[PDB]
Amino acid sequence: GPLIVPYNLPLPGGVVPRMLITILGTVKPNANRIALDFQRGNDVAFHFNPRFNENNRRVIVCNTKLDNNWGREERQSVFPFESGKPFKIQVLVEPDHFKVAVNDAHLLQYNHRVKKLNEISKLGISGDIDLTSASYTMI
């Protein structure tokens, strides 16, 4: 059934290439943000952050947080989410990037800044969503 948000999905032994993480949920009406945070302890290896109202625009911000400091943002103006609507996010771990698809369409890639993939052992899911499922498999 429904999952509680914020939700913490353990990734035992960290991530590896060919691991596929699938998140299903629905965006709340009047949403402000969604965030997926792949964590290495206190560090955020990959923060994927759709913003519904940044200066009255919709944008996806991606970044990494090391020692409590955010790095250089990567921004994507292609925005597949909509308030009130169900979505599927798939994150595929590849050798050199995370690859993100939304509703079965490729969205973006993010080059690995944190290189100890085996230590990226939690995924935090937060924001203005109803969360239906969060799981992983190997492809």
Ligand X SMILES: CC(=O)N[C@H]1[C@H](O[C@H]2[C@@H](O)[C@@H](CO)O[C@@H](O[C@H]3[C@H](O)[C@@H](O)[C@H](O)O[C@@H]3CO)[C@@H]2O)O[C@H](CO)[C@@H](O)[C@@H]1O[C@@H]1O[C@H](CO)[C@H](O)[C@H](O)[C@H]1O
Q: Is 70 in the site for ligand X (CB under 6 A)?
A: yes
Task: Indicate the residue whose CB is closest to ligand X.
Answer: 63
Q: Is 39 in the site for ligand X (CB under 6 A)?
A: no
Report the residue number, 45 or 131, with the smaller CB distance to Cl ion. 45
**Nearest-approach distance from CB 48 to ligand X, in angstroms:** 9
Q: Is 63 in the site for ligand X (CB under 6 A)?
A: yes
Tell me if 64 contacts ligand X by CB under 6 A: no
Q: Is 114 in the site for ligand X (CB under 6 A)?
A: no
Find the part of the chain contacting Cl ion (CB under 5 A) among 42-50, 85-93, 107-115, 128-136.
107-115
What are φ and ψ of residue 23, in 5° steps? Answer: -125, 125
The residue from 41, 73, 103, 118 that contacts ligand X (CB under 6 A) is 73
Q: Does residue 123 contact residue 21 with C-beta atoms inside 8 Å?
A: yes
Q: What is the CA radius of gyration of the chain?
A: 14
Q: Which is nearer to ligand X, 67 or 104 (CB)?
A: 67
Q: DSSP states of the chain as a string?
A: --B-SSEEEE-TT---TTEEEEEEEEEPTT--BEEEEEEETTEEEEEEEEEEEETTEEEEEEEEEETTEE---EEE------TT-EEEEEEEE-SSEEEEEETTEEEEEEE-SS--GGG--EEEEEESEEEEEEEEEE-
Closer residue to ligand X in complex, CB, 44/102: 44
Give the interface with Cl ion as residue ranges (CB under 5 A).
39, 82-83, 94-97, 114-116, 121-122
